[PDB]
Ligand binder design. Sequence first.
Ligand SMILES: NC(=O)c1ccc[n+]([C@@H]2O[C@H](COP(=O)([O-])OP(=O)(O)OC[C@H]3O[C@@H](n4cnc5c(N)ncnc54)[C@H](O)[C@@H]3O)[C@@H](O)[C@H]2O)c1
Ligand SMILES: NC(=O)c1ccc[n+]([C@@H]2O[C@H](COP(=O)([O-])OP(=O)(O)OC[C@H]3O[C@@H](n4cnc5c(N)ncnc54)[C@H](O)[C@@H]3O)[C@@H](O)[C@H]2O)c1
Lengths: 312, 312
Amino acid sequence: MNPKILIIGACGQIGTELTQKLRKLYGTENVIASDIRKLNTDVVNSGPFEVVNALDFNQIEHLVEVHKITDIYLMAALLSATAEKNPAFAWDLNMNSLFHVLNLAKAKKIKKIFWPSSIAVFGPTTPKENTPQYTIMEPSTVYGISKQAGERWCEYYHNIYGVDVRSIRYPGLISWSTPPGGGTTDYAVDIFYKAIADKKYECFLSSETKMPMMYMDDAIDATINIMKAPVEKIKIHSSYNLAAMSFTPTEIANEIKKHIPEFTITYEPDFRQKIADSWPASIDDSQAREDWDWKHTFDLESMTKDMIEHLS
Amino acid sequence: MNPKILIIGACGQIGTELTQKLRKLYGTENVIASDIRKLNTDVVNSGPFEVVNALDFNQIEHLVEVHKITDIYLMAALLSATAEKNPAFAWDLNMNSLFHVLNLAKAKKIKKIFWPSSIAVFGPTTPKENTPQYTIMEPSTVYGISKQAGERWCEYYHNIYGVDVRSIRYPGLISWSTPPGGGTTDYAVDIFYKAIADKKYECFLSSETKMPMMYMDDAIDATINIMKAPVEKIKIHSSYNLAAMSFTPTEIANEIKKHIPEFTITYEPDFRQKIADSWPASIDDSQAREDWDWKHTFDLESMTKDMIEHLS
Ligand SMILES: NC(=O)c1ccc[n+]([C@@H]2O[C@H](COP(=O)([O-])OP(=O)(O)OC[C@H]3O[C@@H](n4cnc5c(N)ncnc54)[C@H](O)[C@@H]3O)[C@@H](O)[C@H]2O)c1
Ligand SMILES: NC(=O)c1ccc[n+]([C@@H]2O[C@H](COP(=O)([O-])OP(=O)(O)OC[C@H]3O[C@@H](n4cnc5c(N)ncnc54)[C@H](O)[C@@H]3O)[C@@H](O)[C@H]2O)c1
């Protein structure tokens, strides 16, 4: 029997693609999209959609019951940069939405959970190159703190209540279908829109800020694959390191220049630079590849090509 | 001026001795003791006392105003063992009482904060001998998770809002004046009461469970000293590793046997063993010794002697 999926925060940068891919694999009506915002987007009209506030346990419980949900992908949360502008609300949403979904699993109302963490769980004291799965983690942002506590609780619920909750620490994600939600790595998306539209871009991070990145297609495959994998293959119950690429603004701008020779870029770092400087440059995701066969397909060159094709 | 102190959770194992010492150093009326419980204890009757619920922000704010408080020692929380019995309430109390005190500082209603963390912040993947100040931390208990998130928020409030909050990761504490509140290291206190009262003890931890311990006298000295130090000497804004002793039940039992020859001990480990097994055996507190000159005074021998003198 195919699972009955509920995607919370389906209108987001990831949710948009995740919902589409899941519907292709398991059927349009087997995947219910939900979000607090209901826009005339493609995801809302291309299948069952439900307005929901992930902050309200009763609203989620109700959708689980009326749509007989077995799997929940909790994507709703405020991102790294946005969360700094409203610490209180970010902590509230990011933590309590997770507690609601975890409690639904604890009560046996759902069977499986996917909840993404982020490379934001790492801090200034975390090794910057090939960051290990198990290492120092002292996040300096509200967002990172919420993701770290989230990981701790996911592991707790698994170990103590037997909840099947799976997670991955997505690096900075890049996509063409929906605008980012205010992460610190959003420049890797913006640069494409401005390069194509204005043929120039003003980057909010300094030129040599090396960071872990991943094309959305890869992020989606990772999400689906860890969830469809047999339970005995999920050996880490906090969150899996996940990697694909690592590059600086100079490098991605140079790759774009191969497609748009006249493209120019200037650098005007803002508060987001301080967040980036507290994160690693590259990630070691060996446990993910070993435990459930994770493998990325896009590198800087293939992603740049695919982005430009989609946007021009 | 001398500080006007408010101790929240003043009737606890640490609070009892902390309130006494602070009153000796700064004056009886300059130290306000508060707790949700008001017993016929020596704490309540030895100076100004206020009933308070640390979970209620307005109640704390009112005491801060009516007593013109400058410093707050937030001791109220549920301990490692007790927290496992009520995860939801433990998370609520431990986290929100801290947010209230941190927010009072953010609003500049108070000047300084002392909030204790614990060795419980460490986990199964944490090096067990001479645990470094900066290391892997994956707490497997609700208590440990609350202390870890607490440390992250203390650092955040300091770094972003300039709040002067100081913390130390107390190892297992041993005292003679007030019973422990349900920690995993409580056997180190119970063994004395049972050795003296019945000359026999049934330990809830296996004989070779080596853990980081500290006599209350040292823990109090550490608390007051880190708070008395000039602000520039406080270089770590999360929480300081703090050490004194490390020993197994076999060793402390042998030390007691020197004073009570007929003392016998048997081992009947319970759920608390699983908690202890996830913690380190010894702690490396050099940052504390070098930043603010931490120096412990009691070792197993001197502590055992002092405990027996107090209890018999
Ligand atoms: N995009 C990335 O580079 C990245 C990196 C690492 C981790 N993540 C994690 O992936 C998840 C999704 O990220 P995204 O980039 O798709 O974010 P997004 O901001 O683009 O999408 C978030 C969605 O959640 C919805 N939402 C907000 N509050 C809600 C509420 N109260 N109830 C219901 N829905 C609500 C929003 O309307 C939005 O459609 C988040 O947990 C994020 O932390 C993302
Ligand atoms: N004793 C130890 O070995 C140890 C070790 C590491 C860290 N710590 C930390 O030190 C602090 C004090 O610990 P303790 O051993 O004194 O614990 P304890 O249980 O003996 O004392 C806690 C006190 O807080 C009070 N309290 C509980 N809820 C309250 C609320 N809602 N409002 C106001 N007061 C409330 C209790 O009545 C009690 O008097 C805690 O943060 C603890 O986690 C203790």
